[PDB]
Design a protein around this ligand. Structure first.
Ligand SMILES: Cn1c(=O)n(CCC(C)(C)O)c2cc(Nc3nc(N4CC(C)(C)OC(C)(C)C4)ncc3Cl)ccc21
Ligand SMILES: Cn1c(=O)n(CCC(C)(C)O)c2cc(Nc3nc(N4CC(C)(C)OC(C)(C)C4)ncc3Cl)ccc21
Lengths: 125, 5, 125, 5
């Protein structure tokens, strides 16, 4: 309806509370396996932030799985950084992690993170 | 094992 | 870490994508029953926006339920408005629905919606 | 029936 009011901080507050659920491991419904390392998350959040998880979990079959193993060439630290971004909007980009973060974001199909990593790499050349 | 390629 | 960058529109983009999942009924894991009317939703989003659903779903037992029946005195239109707010940040407040929306928000323990309804009622008196 | 009171 046309006649609505909007709470400016609502989307951020919701994300904060989803991140708190993640940290307390409440209603997490998937374990993402990256090399030997394990990451518990919510399928909904993963889908909302990644082109790859949107595709996996829209699939009738793969969506009922509690474990998802990622390509062995995926750096765990790179995935951990991107998983923290999904739930907080903050990306921990450092000189020593930008290559692994960009490679991981391309794989996860996270367009904005890819574009940003490109601009930051171009600046250092 | 299997992975997501 | 101190050295992070932040994507301003990320939280809103995530909420938009969760709302799209809701409309397509993807990964919804609960039906909220209000009088005769039924509302499919994600437990995580319900918990993130409501003091009542946070309490229900932190409970070891009630969290494994796929159906939740609300108090019979709860107006379905009032709940539908608040459920739309949870997923979009926009509250459809009208003269003809403010009493039912406030009563529903008090029940759902949605503090900000309660406070706002109070200020809007005080203005019309 | 049961409800959340
Ligand atoms: C390529 N890519 C990304 O980079 N992100 C992250 C997006 C951001 C801005 C949060 O950062 C992506 C998230 C989604 N998520 C979803 N997309 C949709 N869409 C978008 C598409 C293009 C698929 O089309 C329809 C079906 C009409 C609606 N619906 C639901 C979900 Cl959960 C998808 C791709 C992403
Ligand atoms: C009373 N009330 C509301 O009005 N909302 C909506 C909040 C808003 C700003 C989105 O509108 C509530 C959401 C939550 N959600 C959660 N709260 C917490 N909290 C907050 C409390 C106070 C419970 O304490 C701890 C446990 C330390 C962290 N963690 C996770 C979740 Cl999903 C709770 C109450 C709400």
């Amino acid at each position: 309806a046309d006649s609505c009011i909007q709470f400016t901080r609502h989307a951020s507050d919701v994300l904060l509370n989803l991140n708190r659920l993640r940290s307390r491991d409440i209603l997490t419904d998937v374990v993402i396996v990256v090399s030997r390392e394990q990451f518990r998350a919510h399928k909904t959040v993963l889908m909302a932030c990644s082109g790859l998880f949107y595709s996996i979990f829209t699939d009738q079959l793969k969506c009922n799985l509690s474990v998802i193993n990622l390509d062995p060439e995926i750096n765990p630290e790179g995935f951990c950084i991107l998983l923290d971004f999904m739930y907080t909007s903050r990306l921990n980009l450092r000189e020593g992690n930008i290559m692994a973060v960009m490679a991981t974001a391309m794989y996860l199909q996270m367009e904005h993170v890819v574009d940003t990593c490109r601009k930051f790499i171009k600046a250092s050349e | 094992a299997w992975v997501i390629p």
